[PDB]
From Swiss-Prot, chain A:
Belongs to the CWC complex (or CEF1-associated complex), a spliceosome sub-complex reminiscent of a late-stage spliceosome composed of the U2, U5 and U6 snRNAs and at least BUD13, BUD31, BRR2, CDC40, CEF1, CLF1, CUS1, CWC2, CWC15, CWC21, CWC22, CWC23, CWC24, CWC25, CWC27, ECM2, HSH155, IST3, ISY1, LEA1, MSL1, NTC20, PRP8, PRP9, PRP11, PRP19, PRP21, PRP22, PRP45, PRP46, SLU7, SMB1, SMD1, SMD2, SMD3, SMX2, SMX3, SNT309, SNU114, SPP2, SYF1, SYF2, RSE1 and YJU2. Interacts with CLF1, PRP22 and PRP46. Interacts with SPP382. One of its GO terms (biological process) is generation of catalytic spliceosome for second transesterification step. The keyword Methyltransferase does not apply. Belongs to the SNW family. Disulfide bonds: none annotated. Keywords: mRNA processing, mRNA splicing, Nucleus, Spliceosome. It comes from Saccharomyces cerevisiae (strain ATCC 204508 / S288c) (Baker's yeast). Involved in pre-mRNA splicing. Associated with the spliceosome throughout the splicing reactions, until after the second catalytic step. Present with 1670 molecules/cell in log phase SD medium. It is found in: Nucleus. The gene is PRP45. Its main location: nucleus. This is Pre-mRNA-processing protein 45. GO terms for cellular component: nucleus; post-mRNA release spliceosomal complex; Prp19 complex; U2-type catalytic step 1 spliceosome; U2-type catalytic step 2 spliceosome.
From Swiss-Prot, chain E:
This is Pre-mRNA-splicing factor SYF2. The chain holds residues 95 to 212 of 215 of the full protein. Belongs to the NTC complex (or PRP19-associated complex), composed of at least CEF1, CLF1, ISY1, NTC20, SNT309, SYF1, SYF2, and PRP19. Belongs to the SYF2 family. Involved in pre-mRNA splicing and cell cycle control. As a component of the NTC complex (or PRP19-associated complex), associates to the spliceosome to mediate conformational rearrangement or to stabilize the structure of the spliceosome after U4 snRNA dissociation, which leads to spliceosome maturation. The cell cycle arrest of SYF2 defective cells may be due to the inefficient splicing of TUB1.
UniProtKB/Swiss-Prot annotation, chain F:
Component of the U5 snRNP complex required for pre-mRNA splicing. Binds GTP. The lineage of its organism: Eukaryota, Fungi, Dikarya, Ascomycota, Saccharomycotina. Belongs to the TRAFAC class translation factor GTPase superfamily. Classic translation factor GTPase family. EF-G/EF-2 subfamily. Present with 300 molecules/cell in log phase SD medium. This is Pre-mRNA-splicing factor SNU114. The modification Phosphothreonine is found at T20. Belongs to the CWC complex (or CEF1-associated complex), a spliceosome sub-complex reminiscent of a late-stage spliceosome composed of the U2, U5 and U6 snRNAs and at least BUD13, BUD31, BRR2, CDC40, CEF1, CLF1, CUS1, CWC2, CWC15, CWC21, CWC22, CWC23, CWC24, CWC25, CWC27, ECM2, HSH155, IST3, ISY1, LEA1, MSL1, NTC20, PRP8, PRP9, PRP11, PRP19, PRP21, PRP22, PRP45, PRP46, SLU7, SMB1, SMD1, SMD2, SMD3, SMX2, SMX3, SNT309, SNU114, SPP2, SYF1, SYF2, RSE1 and YJU2. The gene is SNU114.
Swiss-Prot record, chain G:
Belongs to the CWC15 family. It is found in: Nucleus. This is Pre-mRNA-splicing factor CWC15. The lineage of its organism: Eukaryota, Fungi, Dikarya, Ascomycota, Saccharomycotina. Disulfide bonds: none annotated. Belongs to the CWC complex (or CEF1-associated complex), a spliceosome sub-complex reminiscent of a late-stage spliceosome composed of the U2, U5 and U6 snRNAs and at least BUD13, BRR2, CDC40, CEF1, CLF1, CUS1, CWC2, CWC15, CWC21, CWC22, CWC23, CWC24, CWC25, CWC27, ECM2, HSH155, IST3, ISY1, LEA1, MSL1, NTC20, PRP8, PRP9, PRP11, PRP19, PRP21, PRP22, PRP45, PRP46, SLU7, SMB1, SMD1, SMD2, SMD3, SMX2, SMX3, SNT309, SNU114, SPP2, SYF1, SYF2, RSE1 and YJU2. Involved in pre-mRNA splicing. The chain holds residues 3 to 42 of 175 of the full protein.
Amino acid sequence: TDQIAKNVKLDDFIPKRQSNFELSVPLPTKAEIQECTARTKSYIQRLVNAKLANSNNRASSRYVTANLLLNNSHHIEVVSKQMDPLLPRFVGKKARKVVAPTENDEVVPVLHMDPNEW
Amino acid sequence: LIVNRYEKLLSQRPEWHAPWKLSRVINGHLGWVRCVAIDPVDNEWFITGSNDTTMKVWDLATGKLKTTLAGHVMTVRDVAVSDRHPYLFSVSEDKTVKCWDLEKNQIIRDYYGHLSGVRTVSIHPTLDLIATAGRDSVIKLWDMRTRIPVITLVGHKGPINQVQCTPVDPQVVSSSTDATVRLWDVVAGKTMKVLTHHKRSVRATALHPKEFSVASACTDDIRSWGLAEGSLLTNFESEKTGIINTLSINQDDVLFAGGDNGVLSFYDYKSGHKYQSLATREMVGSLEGERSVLCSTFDKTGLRLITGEADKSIKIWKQDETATKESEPGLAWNPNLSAKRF
Amino acid sequence: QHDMRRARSIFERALLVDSSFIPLWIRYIDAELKVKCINHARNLMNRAISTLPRVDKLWYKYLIVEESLNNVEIVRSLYTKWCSLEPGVNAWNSFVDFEIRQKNWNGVREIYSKYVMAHPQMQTWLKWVRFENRHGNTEFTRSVYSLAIDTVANLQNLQIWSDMEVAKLVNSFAHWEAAYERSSALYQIAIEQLLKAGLLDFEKQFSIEETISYKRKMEYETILSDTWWLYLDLISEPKQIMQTFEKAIVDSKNVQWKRYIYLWMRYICYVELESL
Amino acid sequence: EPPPNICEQCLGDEANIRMTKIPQGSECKICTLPFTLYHFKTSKRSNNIIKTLICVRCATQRNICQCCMLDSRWHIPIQLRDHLISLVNEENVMTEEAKNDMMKRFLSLKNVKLGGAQITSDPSEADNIVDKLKNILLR
Amino acid sequence: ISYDQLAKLSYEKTLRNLATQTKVQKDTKTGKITIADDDKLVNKLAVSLQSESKKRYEARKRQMQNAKESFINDKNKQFNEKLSRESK
Amino acid sequence: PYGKEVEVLMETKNTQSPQTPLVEPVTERTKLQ
Amino acid sequence: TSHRPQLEARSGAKAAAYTPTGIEHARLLPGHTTLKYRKF
Ligand SMILES: [Zn+2]
Ligand SMILES: [Zn+2]
């Protein structure tokens, strides 16, 4: 019958450096900084190249810096065509207002541990 | 078990720090200083953005003006000088994030895309992007080349007060008025760890410069967070201190905490001990409400401390190199049992 | 309009906007309880607990729903979770009242042991003393008193409670053992000033003149910190009394002068009572 | 950038099939959001061109493919597989299809598998409901 | 007083209301907890919450009924009652 | 006003011409062009 | 009462949910395309 309040513990309430003032929370290593910043630089480079190559500026093509297995059998070559240069390059793109759902995958604890003059 | 925790606190003792007293008052601005930034290499100067829209570049060793950077039209809220670039990113509430090329002292880049007023910058120190967030409850990351909002960061409810960036994930340690210190995944765009231990608006998060931790400050509770997992390290003492505007963390583990009540409170960052509580004197003609310490920073070395207050003044605080552990021991180490803050 | 998935969607979007607003929670819980749907309400209040643990009314309303559903083992689980989260004193008091109206006396000692371990003040110890005193097992009550005095004698260095609460505990122990030798003994050991005053009062409750006189003497010195007091001190004495009188005199512009004169006179009187 | 759901019947009885991706091709025929559209030909000399008509999130919300609009596991219509799940579990599992535009966009962006999509998603509960179908056709 | 104490006192009041009135299974795969809840207890809670809501409803209507300084419409006399309560 | 340990600095005038940079544009190759 | 103060801001979640239209603005034209670096 301990299935109630599965996400709340004292290990969130209790400060960890309380028992030990020496408790080392070390800086990340130089190798970890290099790995994480190379990964995020490649990701930001992906998003900059996507948000520049989807522009109508021809001069956005200069500051920018395919085989697909389906279910079991279909080894598929994916060939993006040459679009017509006069047509809308993204005819599916349209101005629209969208309400995105703010889903709750896991219930987040909100932990507040703790008259006449106002 | 609580009695064991209190006894293990009372077993340990805090570290002594040198007492801070004021050394220099700079009275230049025609408005309130809202954020102070200092160059992370040279220590030749520090720039204080103020409500009279004019950032002023003051001098550490002499206290002189050298230049005035007045490209905004609204109140300059945050100023963040780059570490590996000769830039100066100046969030105001013009809805504009302006880049100041410090080899030219000119505006070069204007980051448009914010939906309301902006409150804070956070230059990611080992990449070429800046983290700007404000009243519109969403952090926009900005590639500094293409001026594009690269990664929106969705999930804070109210206006976002102070954003800090780390070189390793959590690469955006942000905090808002919904009392949440969210740790962000810049790749996934999702909050890895939502820290909901504060009660009111967290106006202040400061990076520890020599360990991977962030101190965050609500009213009368300042809490230190280990960013490796998102764990509480120390709940500071901070009883009846007031509304904390800004924090700043020394290299030598001295934590400033400026209150709206004019009070200062220097904290031993390891132990959570409050040792010194100043009273910032107002100017000779101020109102009593203008004692508040709006913003602060340390020196790169940490031996200085700069505060911009709301009495149109800039005060510099330095340690007593003549006091010892037996001369001025600070306040007493006695954790309080009526509070659960210990 | 009796469509419940719509009203549930509306309350859930309202919780998505501001989840901290408690009347929204209480009305959505009572909404799913008016339609006699308690499994939905138990999912709901488990969400309301895991969201806001430090809010009392969500806990107490879930405890009400499990009271009138008469699922007692659930309420055991609910309070043993809620008391693990170092809650307020009202939470533990409600859990003690729960395991009183569930007449299960062997559990309440463990409940008060963990409530000692959560909130150490002597009023909590005297809640546990009052529980065991109303429910009649004198070996267990003096076990509780002895454990309380052992925790006081082990937490002297902690400054966890005042000496006033130490006086509360030891005076309760003494006035309980009058119902006698133990209490006097505790006070004696306790002496090891305010606590001492308690011993005097207690002896008074149950040789007596000297302690009463001595006890009476203590407030006097306090008060001063006047002539009457000095006189009393003198009476109590002798050299010490004289000294006190002198001090008083010293303590005592025209008004000041008068006071000084009075003090001098007092000193003279003392000397006489006792030339150089 | 998720790869599409196209089942074995739309692509056909070939091993090497060349499809054409257009990023942000058209609005999907469920939620009217744009998506990367994949059009191809079943043979090399097919006269019919076959294109994906729903986006990937609308495909995985119904556990259906993007071209023939039938189930990914079973290759049957959505309404009838929901009817079969209602025959099995004695619970009217229906696919709640939207009709307002904002409701279409809202109902596609959320992370859930609506309708009878969760049963046919993993093969374990798929074969569980399959031998329950065999138990029904024994009765 | 305060919201904590007021929640405590309302809990004590509802236990007094019960004093004037007066298993657990799980599946393997789904893991959802089926609790047997007696129908008399279910609709007794339902009738109790509806009775508390209607009791509060009628007492709030009783406070709505009372009208006895200077006002133009109904919201205005409420605001003037608020200012008269501020005047101590 | 604050003591006689503390510098009090009333300053309204810029003590450096605004055309000069703050961070120096460093160049190792001495261009004599 | 048709004019009102601000309760909360238009959140950037609502701007992150909208799909963009490509409107090449007069100021997002490429300019200052070199990031200057400091000494170390
Ligand atoms: Zn769709
Ligand atoms: Zn198909």
